[PDB]
Amino acid sequence: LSPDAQVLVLAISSHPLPTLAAFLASRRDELLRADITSLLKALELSGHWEWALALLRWAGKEGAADASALEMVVRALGREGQHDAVCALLDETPLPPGSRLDVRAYTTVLHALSRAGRYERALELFAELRRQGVAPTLVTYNVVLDVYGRMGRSWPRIVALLDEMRAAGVEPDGFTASTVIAACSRDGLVDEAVAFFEDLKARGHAPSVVTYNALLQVFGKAEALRVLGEMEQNGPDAVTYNELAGTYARAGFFEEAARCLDTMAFTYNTVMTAYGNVGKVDEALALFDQMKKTGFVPNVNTYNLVLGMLGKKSRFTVMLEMLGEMSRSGCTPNRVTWNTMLAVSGKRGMEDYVTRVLEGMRSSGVELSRDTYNTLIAAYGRCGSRTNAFKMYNEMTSAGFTPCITTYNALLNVLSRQGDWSTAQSIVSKMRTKGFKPNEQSYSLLLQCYAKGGNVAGIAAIENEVYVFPSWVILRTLVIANFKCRRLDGMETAFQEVKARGYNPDLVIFNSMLSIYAKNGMYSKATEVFDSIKRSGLSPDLITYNSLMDMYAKCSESWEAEKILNQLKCSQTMKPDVVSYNTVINGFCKQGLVKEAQRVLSEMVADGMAPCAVTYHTLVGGYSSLEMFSEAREVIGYMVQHGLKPMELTYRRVVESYCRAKRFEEARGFLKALEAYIEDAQF
Amino acid sequence: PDAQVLVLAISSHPLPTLAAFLASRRDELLRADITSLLKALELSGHWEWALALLRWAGKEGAADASALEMVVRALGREGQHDAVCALLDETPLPPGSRLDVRAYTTVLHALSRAGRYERALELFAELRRQGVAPTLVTYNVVLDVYGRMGRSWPRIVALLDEMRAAGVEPDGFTASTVIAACSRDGLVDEAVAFFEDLKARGHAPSVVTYNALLQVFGKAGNYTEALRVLGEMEQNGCQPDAVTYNELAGTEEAARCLDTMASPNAFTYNTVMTAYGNVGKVDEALALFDQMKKTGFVPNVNTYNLVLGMLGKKSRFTVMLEMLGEMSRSGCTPNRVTWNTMLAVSGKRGMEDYVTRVLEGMRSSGVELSRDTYNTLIAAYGRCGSRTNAFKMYNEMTSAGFTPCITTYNALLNVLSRQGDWSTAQSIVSKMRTKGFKPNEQSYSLLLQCYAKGGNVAGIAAIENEVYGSGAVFPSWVILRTLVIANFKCRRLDGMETAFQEVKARGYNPDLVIFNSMLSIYAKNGMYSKATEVFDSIKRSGLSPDLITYNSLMDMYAKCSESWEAEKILNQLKCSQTMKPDVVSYNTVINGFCKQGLVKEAQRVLSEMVADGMAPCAVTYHTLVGGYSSLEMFSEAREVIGYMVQHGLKPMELTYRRVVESYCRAFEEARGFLSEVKALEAYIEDA
RNA sequence: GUAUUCUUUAAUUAUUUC
RNA sequence: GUAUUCAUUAUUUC
């Protein structure tokens, strides 16, 4: 409008937001003389809804904001969807005393509070709304009914409002019906929901899709029998389908739905999906058969769906069967099919499956692409068939395809399992000359080959090249990788770096840390950790609790470890673990305290737990220590007398202790290379 | 002697070259106790090396069965099943060789773990063709093989006889395997008879045994018989472990499960509650929880937090709050875990008031807030989008004497990311900088998203340049992901191709979000060539095209003025059997005609749309008018209007704007049309 | 301005608007 | 070496 005002507006929309108020002040008099409403509008067209906001708040604090000013921002805020801002204009009103608003605007604020769970404020506002003589509209009504619906237990107030609205001649719509039914749905008002809809009929009213889904939902968590039926034939399965997907989980039946559906594709596929995503594939395959059994001829896309849900259950045998019915019915498998048959969540016996998929994947033409081979490598990688992954890697290249980074990472996954790093290094080095530079994943997979290789070299060689941006994964992978190698420098090093970069560490790191102190020479940072893990608000684990006991055990303070064990007995959620029992027994044994140690073994059994090899092994050590070899020999009996099968270390610890005690023929009688240990000892 | 020195050589050598290295010190090897070298190489965990030598020696003819058996024990002990199936397949033994049973059974199990059953049976046949006597574990492994093939019950009954005829007595491993086999075929009756018959032999069953007998009933059948087993279980005195309740959980139904185990402890109750939780059936666990009380045992805070957590993931606010009150009313006073659990809730509607209602309890609970608690509260208020309250929580943090961390600044930017309020987002990151803090990646993602919802393209590019060069921010899948999106929302084609470039270059494997966006952006221009290449490349990737992929394709053809091809897909989606055309699908098709004309065709589509049920929207009609509004025709676009309000759908701003502009440019016959009923009637004035 | 399940470490003010 | 459901090639081995 005004050239002076256009300059002012441009000057406002260009100014940063944090400084703007100190700026608007400087132009106080300049602003007051103008039409803010016109500035707000101009600041809204230009796409700067947040600058008008600032202006409004400024003017309210000055007295130059009117209803129309506010009403303009609000309409902008709701179309833009900034409920928070709406709610704040209401909590810090830029309005002068009198001040009444347009209906549309009040209903936008009501929706904003609703959107925030401030149902109690919405109702306060609604009351204030009609005591100022504002005629609410259909949308205002529907918004308020929604407030009542999510606030809960407000059915009577809903009856009241429906009355009030009709008595003022505002007939309900579809947003009114669904809103209401979902309200009954959230309160278990099954009975009164139906009487409602069936009253909607009376007064006239065309039924709907969203309606039925709401009604559906009622009987859902609440009947889906004679009900869900109507919804169909009444008239289209859109969202209504999903409702079936959770209908099954909150209940339990396979006969009614078969008996129902019988009586009657997507619709079919929907219900099948409902079964296979909650883990009822046996239930879906039956739905599939029934479906086939009645005319219906599935296409490739229906098979890919069934195979897809069978796949998450690793039902290899029937996936191949389905693969059969396809190709022998015309339904030629597509790319999506093989990818589906190869994206199986790994189980035991996956290799031969994969092998059979590949056999039909190559006995049916289908020229394997580059990505196809990568998919086939990943598959044998999941199983762990290094042998078959690499045969695929070799067949690949020998056919002229060029391996990508996805192909190298695949192979790298494998070796990682087996901690074969000498082969990993070769992969990496190969990929570099080919031009391919390792990514983050490629590194984590290296860190894991090394750790299972006990190669600290390659570990610290990477810790250097990274300290390779250190991502939360890499730093977390490094903390672990060092713990397998039990490396305190490395672990600690990158521990604080995880904090200095604004990452929140999980119980894994904390647990891993606590123990690299317990079994080491630090026993206070440990206490720091168990105080940090808590101060952090995290819930300690048994493992955490067990690692804890090991600390006290190594600090020669065992009863305290016994306390934590006992305290676990009440935990009501924790519940010891022979490890916890073992760990405590190991400590007492380590301090010469062995009666106390078998006293906890007695509890152990009494509690109905189950002593094991390692458990007995501990005592034999602690007995051998203070040379009292008879009570020790009595133990190994117990193990075997109960068939617990001792360990050569159980024997060694006695042999080596029988040697040092000047008793040689004893070491001999009692009793491989061990006897040899006595010979090189005796003389 | 001289061996200890030679082992270290092989133990310290590049694996992919060890062959030629064993070829080197060959004659020192042939005179060395191979099996001896093997035993030594394993004593240091160098088992990959003991294999390579085996294969070497084998190729030289220097490996005997005693050696192979030695490598196999380790592999099995080191869990290396594929490697053993390899030895089976290549054979490093000379002709006429026979192996220990312990080894043979280690291979059988290895063949079983790869699904190579038909092969395991053939090896078993050989093993007993060499007059080797199988042991218990051998018989048991083979049983496990029979049980995973299917239709193998007679072979199980027959082998049971043999093994029992060789004086070999079944065990718990046997029982669980035979019962579990019957569970994998639906052999309910025989599993029972077998159990009955096995019991009657004096065999005391066990947990594992009872667990398989229960999977029978529960897998595909009944919850009443499986529950009965649960019955007979305790009656025997065998305590159901965690795996027990998992079977039931996966097998008014919660009222039953509690009636049986009634004729337990607090840990028991939690074990079954958590079972139903981890399955996804939580209303049941609640039901038990109602009983654990009205039955005696009183739950503590650990038990309650457990329950709250379950509710958390379902974000069942009101009940969570009820439960927090019953806690503090029945005596159970919350802890730092209780609160944190309460604020770790899943985003949703009305979450802001919940958090306020929780914080209201943290405060009254006279519990000093810590630096951590603030970070949580800021995060939750930031997660629901209560920008206003996050910042209030923020200033309250930095005023009680706590120091923000990066998470603290990240929470805050998360909110702004939803609002697009990048100006503040900047002002923050700098503050993060002026405090000795360096922005994370997510910090860069948030800021990125923050610029997107706004429209600030200069801050995006300012991120790309700092990402495509310096190391301040590494091109992480995430960061490149947040870029394809933030450039779409701002329609920066150039800046997406670069990202789709690097993604398909930095070793990444694009996702449907990325593909589709690329498809819609190319389609939003005439970019047919690339777009179709993207679509197929979706196919060549191995992903399933959703509706948005199909709608974007139709709009491309629209855009390319081939709207007939657009309907072929709508038809194709009509019989997709898996994908049902969407409202936006139909419109996209109609507009494509109306954009190039043939509105009588546009009517053709609308017709069936209604024929397929399908209830049209405003846009549906606003588009139909477009063609009828600007096609030397007005008597129709007026008749078409009477289908909106007369059908209570209500037109809109883009609509009428097409009526005046199109009519006031096709005059007077336009004036009377607009008179039939603000911001517009200045266009007419402008004309 | 409003409704029916999933979505809340979010493509869901995602793709259609002569 | 072998079995039951769906950081673990995790924490205890005088």
From Swiss-Prot, chain B:
Top-rank taxon, per record: Eukaryota
One biological process term in Gene Ontology: mRNA stabilization
Stored InterPro entries: Pentatricopeptide_rpt, TPR-like_helical_dom_sf
The entry's keywords: Chloroplast, mRNA processing, Plastid, Repeat, RNA-binding, Transit peptide
Pfam family of the protein (one): PPR_3
An example Gene Ontology molecular-function term: identical protein binding
Subcellular location: Plastid, Chloroplast stroma
Disruption phenotype: Yellow-green seedling phenotype. Seedling lethality after the development of three leaves. Defects in plastid mRNA metabolism and reduced levels of subunits of several photosynthetic enzyme complexes.
GO annotation, cellular component aspect: chloroplast stroma
Coiled coil (residue ranges): none
Residue spans of the PPR repeats: 64-94, 100-134, 135-170, 171-205, 206-240, 241-264, 265-299, 300-334, 335-369, 370-404, 405-439, 440-474, 476-510, 511-545, 546-580, 582-616, 617-651, 652-677
Keyword Signal: no
Main function: Involved in chloroplast mRNA stability. Binds specifically to two intergenic RNA regions of similar sequence located in the chloroplast atpH 5'-UTR and psaJ 3'-UTR, and serves as a barrier to RNA decay. Binding to a specific site in the intergenic region of the chloroplast atpH is sufficient to block 5'-3' and 3'-5' exonucleases. Acts as a protein barrier to block mRNA degradation by exonucleases, and defines processed mRNA termini in chloroplasts. Remodels the structure of the atpH ribosome-binding site in a manner that can account for its ability to enhance translation.
Subunit and partners: Forms homodimers.
Homology family: Belongs to the PPR family. P subfamily.
Name this polypeptide is given: Pentatricopeptide repeat-containing protein 10, chloroplastic
Annotated source species: Zea mays
Source organism phylogeny: Eukaryota, Viridiplantae, Streptophyta, Embryophyta, Tracheophyta
Record gene name: PPR10
